[PDB]
C-alpha cells in the first residue's frame, strides 16, 4: 500500500512527503501554534497545501489500528507536571483529565504520524494512544525515520478523533496513561 500511494504521487509530492517525515517538528509546531489555520508564513503554507494534496491521493485499504507515544505535555500546563506524582499517576487529577477528555472529539492540528505494531509496541513514554483508522480514510504509509519498524502511517493535519476510553495501565515499574480513540 506504500507502493500504491507512491504510484499516484508526482515526483515533487514524494520529495515533500519525505521532507516532512524527516523534518516533522517544524511543520507541526507551526500548525499547532496557529490552531491549524494558514496564512501566517506564506512560504511554508505553500508546502502544506501540497502535502495536504498528496495525502488526499491516499485511501486506506482496510480499517487499521495504529499507535503514538507522547509525554505529558500534550495535556497542557496544569496537567503536565501534576498528572504524575513520582512514578504514579495522580488519581484525583486523572479523574479530572478523563472527565475533560473521554467521550469527546479532539483535533490534532499537526500532521499525525502513527506507528504500526508488528511484533512490538514501543510504549515507554508516559502516554500511549491507540487509534482506529477507518477503511477509506486519507492516510498514507511512509518510510519510518528510525530505520524500529519499516513503516509509519501518516494522517492528514486537522485529523479529528473521538476519545472512546481513557485509563491507567499499571505496569511492574511504571504507570501508563492509555488513550483509545477512533479517527473520524
Positions that interact with a copy of itself (CB under 8 A): 12, 15-16, 18-19, 21-27, 29-30, 41, 43-44, 71-73, 80-82, 84-85, 87, 122, 124-126, 145, 147, 173-174
Cα–Cα distance for residue pair 71/58, rounded to 1 Å: 29
Q: Which does 184 bind (CB under 5 to 8 A by kind): a copy of itself, Mg ion, none?
A: none
Q: Which of 13, 113, 115, 180 is catalytic?
A: 113
SS (H, E, C) 10-74: CHHHHHHHHHHHHCHHHHHHHHHHCCCCCCCCHHHHHHHHHHHHHHHCCCCCCCEEEEEEECHHH
Q: Which of 58, 68, 108, 157 is catalytic?
A: 68
Residue 77 grid cell: 500546563
Q: Is 12 in the site for Mg ion (CB under 5 A)?
A: no
Q: Which does 171 bind (CB under 5 to 8 A by kind): a copy of itself, Mg ion, none?
A: Mg ion
Cα–Cα distance for residue pair 152/115, rounded to 1 Å: 5
Please identify, among the stretches 66-74, 78-86, 134-142, 172-180, the one whose residues bind Mg ion according to the rule CB under 5 A. Answer: 172-180
Task: Tell me if residue 68 is catalytic.
Answer: yes
Q: Which does 84 bind (CB under 5 to 8 A by kind): Mg ion, a copy of itself, none?
A: a copy of itself
Cα–Cα distance for residue pair 115/141, rounded to 1 Å: 10
Q: What residues act catalytically?
A: 68, 113, 152
Amino acid at each position: 500500500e506504500y507502493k500504491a500511494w507512491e504510484k499516484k504521487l508526482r515526483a515533487n509530492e514524494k520529495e515533500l512527503v519525505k521532507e516532512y517525515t524527516a523534518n516533522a517538528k517544524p511543520f507541526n509546531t507551526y500548525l499547532r501554534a496557529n490552531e491549524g489555520k494558514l496564512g501566517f508564513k506564506p512560504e511554508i503554507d505553500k508546502k502544506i497545501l501540497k502535502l495536504d494534496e498528496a495525502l488526499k491521493k491516499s485511501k486506506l485499504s482496510e480499517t487499521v489500528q495504529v499507535y503514538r507515544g507522547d509525554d505529558t505535555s500534550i495535556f497542557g500546563k496544569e496537567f503536565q507536571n501534576s498528572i504524575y506524582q513520582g512514578n504514579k499517576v495522580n488519581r484525583e487529577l486523572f479523574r479530572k483529565l478523563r472527565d475533560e477528555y473521554q467521550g469527546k472529539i479532539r483535533t490534532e492540528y499537526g500532521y499525525l504520524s502513527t506507528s504500526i505494531v508488528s511484533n512490538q509496541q514501543f510504549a515507554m513514554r508516559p502516554v500511549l494512544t491507540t487509534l482506529k483508522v477507518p477503511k477509506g480514510a486519507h492516510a498514507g504509509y511512509v518510510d519510518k525515520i528510525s530505520q524500529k519498524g519499516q513503516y509509519e502511517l501518516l494522517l492528514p493535519r486537522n485529523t479529528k478523533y473521538k476519545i472512546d476510553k481513557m485509563y491507567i495501565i499499571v505496569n511492574k515499574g511504571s504507570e501508563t496513561i492509555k488513550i483509545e480513540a477512533t479517527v473520524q
